[PDB]
Amino acid sequence: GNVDVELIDKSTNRYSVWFPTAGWYLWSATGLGFLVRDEVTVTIAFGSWSQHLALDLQHHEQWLVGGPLFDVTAEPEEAVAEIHLPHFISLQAGEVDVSWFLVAHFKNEGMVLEHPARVEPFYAVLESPSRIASGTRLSIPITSNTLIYYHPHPEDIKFHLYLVPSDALLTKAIDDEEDRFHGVRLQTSPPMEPLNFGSSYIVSNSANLKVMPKELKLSYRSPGEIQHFSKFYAGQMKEPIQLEITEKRHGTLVWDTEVKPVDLQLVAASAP
């Protein structure tokens, strides 16, 4: 079931985990499946894609980086046999190919890219690692960057401040370490997170999204955009103002280039 953590230091965010026996061992707090065969003393640290990538492949238009970055260190020689590793990009037959997937390893050599064997609908398998900084995700399309097509999960907060609810809506791809870093970055004006997911359809990279309130308040910063970046920067936030304690809120994420929208929720003020 659920396995413990030991935080050695919160700054570079390194965890030591005791793994008892063989097992599948899914850990969905960040999304790691550890097919192991013995006692494993494993350490997982925090990596950012800006400092380790070679600075050409962020702005490269056939090198869309996915996933978060992990410095995993474990016991070799079939002790940790497979690493099911969290990507986010979608698994459809058209415009996405399995051979476009690559897994990188950030050695002191540099970046070692190999094809994986199988892709799972949130994960990809890493077969028999030989060790640090290896939890990675890259992709080589032969087609442009604008159509890798994975949809964010939104997260929105209603907060009471000078008796006026400020909302907080962010739309980023599913990276739980990026989610918790945006949470602790927003914790200066602290969040409270209800459980809603806007995973209705597929929306691509460099998509300009309009925020529409169906019943209207003061609408602010309406042309938002879909970007991905490392686990430090300011997001594409939305902070509308409610100014009252009315119960229901109807929000819509709608495209501009094509007439079809992507997302609609109706959210209550049950626990403000």
């Binding site: 070679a54 600075l55 050409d56 492949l57 702005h59 490269h60 238009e61 056939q62 090198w63 690559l102 002191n108 050599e109 540099g110 970046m111 070692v112 890219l113 190999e114 094809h115 442009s144 604008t146």
Partner: protein, 827 residues
């Protein structure tokens, strides 16, 4: 006439056209990253660490504006079904090397592991990989202080003694030492009292015409070994340099970059007919104690004057030394540039230099009778000598005569091919005190043998900083060539003992710029195709050591992935065709985007056409000719042709422009247009634009003069309007001498044929950079002058801050929006 089948380009506003050019150049800063170059492999020799080598190179890692020295770590083992991409580690810790920018070039000495380079108005050095270990984290580079004032141009470390180095300061050769900080001038010929109009003596510098038409950027060469005079313990250290006097050569004033001051700079510019600068070879020696302090010094000069010992020798193309140090070699060349000959000058041939003519006689007596210069090789041709800097001599430790060398020879068969040539150094015996006139071929050695290592209808890349790599223990020579196809540059290897099969080491379907290890176990290739953008891969020669020729190059690691094309980039299509003389010419075409069958689109014939430039090849054009794709994306067919006169097709091909340049290449461009018109179906012959830069603009004007019925407009950029004003090295090489070839000078000087330009307006746009040092603004001025005098219209555009290539992006953006506007309205 019939507008049903004619594509009309959508007329955009000026701000629209700027929006289009910016949308073109969003990824232009990404598609070129100053891809790494000047590679230097050094082994680790540790047997327990993980890295087999360290590759040193120049690069900008895209995280900074500056070009800097970097390195990668080449491992001992990488696995298949993988792809290793190297991190670009720093040796210089995040400072600025500019007041392209950064460190332009650097010098390296292998044994000490010394990296001496030039950066922001000062000299710098660092060290890595000698008896000192290979570091990991970068340190500060040590700056070399000086008491002398001015910039320190072109520094080189002495190979014989790495503690000492040398540089040019104020057009005189200086020498210094890294650890003690001491320096000393060696040539005292340039006093620097006033302008170059009154101080014309230079030393160790490459002049204008040598620098820009013979592609030599230095005029001094260290001796690689240290002789011992043996007074008590003194270590002699020689340098060959070329003294050059520029007194009797014409001075031209060209505007300085600082336009506010309204000052010019004088330039010793030898135009055709006028006298080239007066050259000579010279020895600057000095000696050293064991502690590493200079003691004595000495200028030396040949026993005869240089002009008399080597009559009708006009240019020193190249020079250097044999690896043992026993001779200083030099490639000489005649003023028509058809009579190249290599000469070896043994250091005892140079007596000291004094004004005392009796001391001069004294050491003229002192020089032995046996020593002389041996002319080993003499390339003579009826077209012109293309100067190939491929020599490499072999050591001759047994039998101290019988020189064995390698030599590129295009004049022999018509194509640049390597040869192994063994000449015999037989001394005739000369009393060097008596002055005399040498005969025509009295220093010419007879040749023992001249085996040809390569042969065929293809040529070996020799110029433009390409080179050969000679592994002497496996007895192989690695060269680059066009053996598979003229459109591609491939790394080949062959044996120089047994000239058998020539093995290609690079993957076909691409064009490659390669660089070997000094230990010949792995190379780099920076390569690209027309479709694939440039990548830089590290390959590894691997196999049984008993057969080193067939060592299979297996891909080891990758430096950069192909920094890709824009989404508005479709690759152009290469084609070929035959002329009426049945000569195969190659060409490219960019098709109009969203092409519909039936419509005849307007066609921009881009052109250079001149020698030493191959426009069509299987290399990536998007990094440099993005504008051609922008034209295509607006709907223009863009055609690019290499007619007769282009390079990389042999001497007989290049020589079709001989003494009539401007007349036959444009005919080939017209024929290429007519070929593309019948083969494809989207060429509107009524709407044809011709366009190009300096030679291309000269041809664009020849197109509008001698073929006005086909070319509707002509965008001539920086044109050569009078060949009488262009300098010696280029113009005389192809167009013989002015006073000999007056018929071809007048026939091919476009500014004298303005009467044949169209009386209709809006057909000719002249572009020119005001500060151009190569094809001076006088050329455009004299053209517009003769347009005024003939009463013919023109449009004109100036780039007041741009010299030859439009370097700064706002000026390039204006150039492009002007090109799009001119085509929209008047094509």
């Amino acid at each position: 006439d019939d507008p049903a089948a004619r594509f009309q380009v959508q007329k955009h506003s000026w701000d629209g056209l700027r929006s289009i050019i910016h949308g073109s150049r969003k990824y232009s800063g990404l598609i070129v990253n100053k891809a790494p170059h000047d590679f230097q492999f050094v082994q680790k020799t540790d047997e327990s660490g993980p890295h087999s080598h360290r590759l040193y190179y120049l690069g900008m890692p895209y995280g900074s504006r500056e070009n800097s020295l970097l390195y990668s770590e080449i491992p001992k083992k990488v696995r298949k079904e993988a792809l290793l991409l190297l991190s670009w580690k720093q040796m210089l810790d995040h400072f600025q090397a500019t007041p392209v920018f950064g460190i332009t070039s650097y010098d390296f000495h292998s044994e000490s592991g010394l990296f001496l380079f030039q950066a922001s108005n000062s000299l710098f050095h660092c060290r890595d990989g000698g008896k000192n270990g290979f570091m990991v984290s970068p340190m500060k580079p040590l700056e070399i202080k000086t008491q002398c004032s001015g910039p320190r141009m072109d520094p080189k470390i002495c190979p014989a003694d790495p503690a000492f180095f040398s540089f040019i300061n104020n057009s005189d050769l200086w020498v210094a030492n890294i650890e003690t900080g001491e320096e000393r001038r060696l040539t005292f010929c340039h006093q620097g009292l006033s302008n170059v109009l009154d101080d014309p003596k230079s030393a160790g510098v490459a002049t204008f015409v040598i620098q820009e038409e013979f592609d030599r950027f230095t005029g001094y060469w260290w001796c690689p070994t240290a002789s011992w005079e043996g007074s008590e313990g003194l270590k002699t250290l020689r340098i060959l340099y070329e003294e050059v006097d520029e007194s009797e050569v014409e001075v031209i004033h060209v505007p300085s970059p600082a336009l506010e001051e309204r000052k010019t700079d004088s330039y010793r510019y030898p135009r055709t007919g006028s006298k080239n600068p007066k050259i000579a070879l010279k020895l600057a020696e000095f000696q050293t104690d064991s502690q590493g302090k200079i003691v004595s010094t000495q200028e030396k000069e040949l026993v005869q004057p240089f002009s008399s010992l080597f009559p009708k020798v006009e240019y020193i193309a190249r020079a250097g030394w044999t690896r043992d140090g026993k001779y200083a070699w030099a490639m000489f060349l005649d003023r028509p540039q058809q009579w190249l000959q290599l000469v070896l000058l043994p250091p005892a041939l140079f007596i000291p230099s004094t004004e005392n003519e009796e001391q001069r006689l004294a050491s003229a007596r002192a020089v032995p009778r046996n020593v002389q210069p041996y002319v080993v090789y003499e390339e003579v041709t009826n077209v012109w000598i293309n100067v190939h800097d491929i020599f490499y001599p072999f050591p001759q430790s047994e039998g101290e005569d019988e020189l064995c060398f390698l030599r590129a020879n295009e004049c022999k068969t018509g194509f640049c091919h390597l040869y192994k040539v063994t000449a015999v150094l037989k001394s005739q015996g000369y009393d060097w005190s008596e002055p005399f006139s040498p005969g025509e071929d009295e220093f010419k050695c007879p040749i023992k043998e001249e085996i040809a290592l390569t042969s065929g209808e293809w040529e070996v890349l020799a110029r433009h900083g390409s080179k050969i790599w000679v592994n002497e223990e496996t007895k192989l020579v690695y060269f680059q060539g066009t053996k598979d196809t003229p459109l591609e540059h491939h790394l080949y290897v062959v044996s120089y003992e047994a000239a058998g099969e020539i093995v290609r080491l690079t993957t076909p379907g691409f064009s490659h710029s390669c660089s070997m290890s000094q230990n010949f176990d792995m190379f780099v290739s920076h390569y690209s195709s027309v479709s694939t953008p440039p990548c830089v891969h590290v390959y590894k020669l691997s196999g049984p050591d008993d057969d080193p020729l067939h060592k299979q190059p297996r891909f080891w690691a990758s430096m950069m992935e192909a920094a890709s094309c824009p989404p508005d980039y479709v690759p152009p299509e290469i084609f070929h065709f035959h002329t009426r003389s049945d000569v195969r010419l190659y060409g490219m075409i960019y098709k109009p985007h969203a092409l519909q069958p039936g419509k005849k689109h307007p066609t921009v014939l881009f052109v250079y056409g001149g020698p030493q430039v191959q426009l069509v090849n299987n290399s990536f054009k998007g990094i440099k000719y993005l504008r051609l794709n922008t034209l295509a994306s607006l709907g223009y067919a863009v055609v690019v042709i290499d007619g007769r006169g282009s390079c990389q097709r042999g001497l007989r091909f290049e020589g079709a422009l001989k003494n009539q340049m401007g007349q036959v290449e444009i005919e080939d461009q017209v024929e290429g247009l007519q070929f593309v018109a019948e083969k494809y179906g989207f060429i509107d012959l009524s709407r044809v634009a011709i366009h190009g830069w300096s030679y291309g603009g000269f041809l664009s004007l020849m197109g509008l003069i001698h073929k006005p019925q086909v070319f509707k407009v002509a965008i001539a950029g920086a044109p050569v309007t009078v060949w009488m004003a262009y300098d010696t090295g280029y113009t005389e090489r192809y167009m013989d001498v002015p006073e000999n070839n007056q018929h071809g000078y007048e026939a091919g000087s476009v500014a004298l044929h303005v009467e044949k330009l169209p009386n209709e307006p809006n057909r000719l746009l002249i572009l020119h950079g005001f500060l151009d040092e190569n094809v001076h603004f006088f050329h455009t001025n004299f053209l517009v002058s003769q347009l005024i005098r003939a009463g013919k219209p023109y449009q004109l555009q100036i780039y007041p801050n741009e010299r030859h290539s439009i370097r700064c992006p706002e000026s390039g953006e204006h150039y492009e929006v002007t090109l799009l506007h001119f085509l929209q309205e008047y094509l």
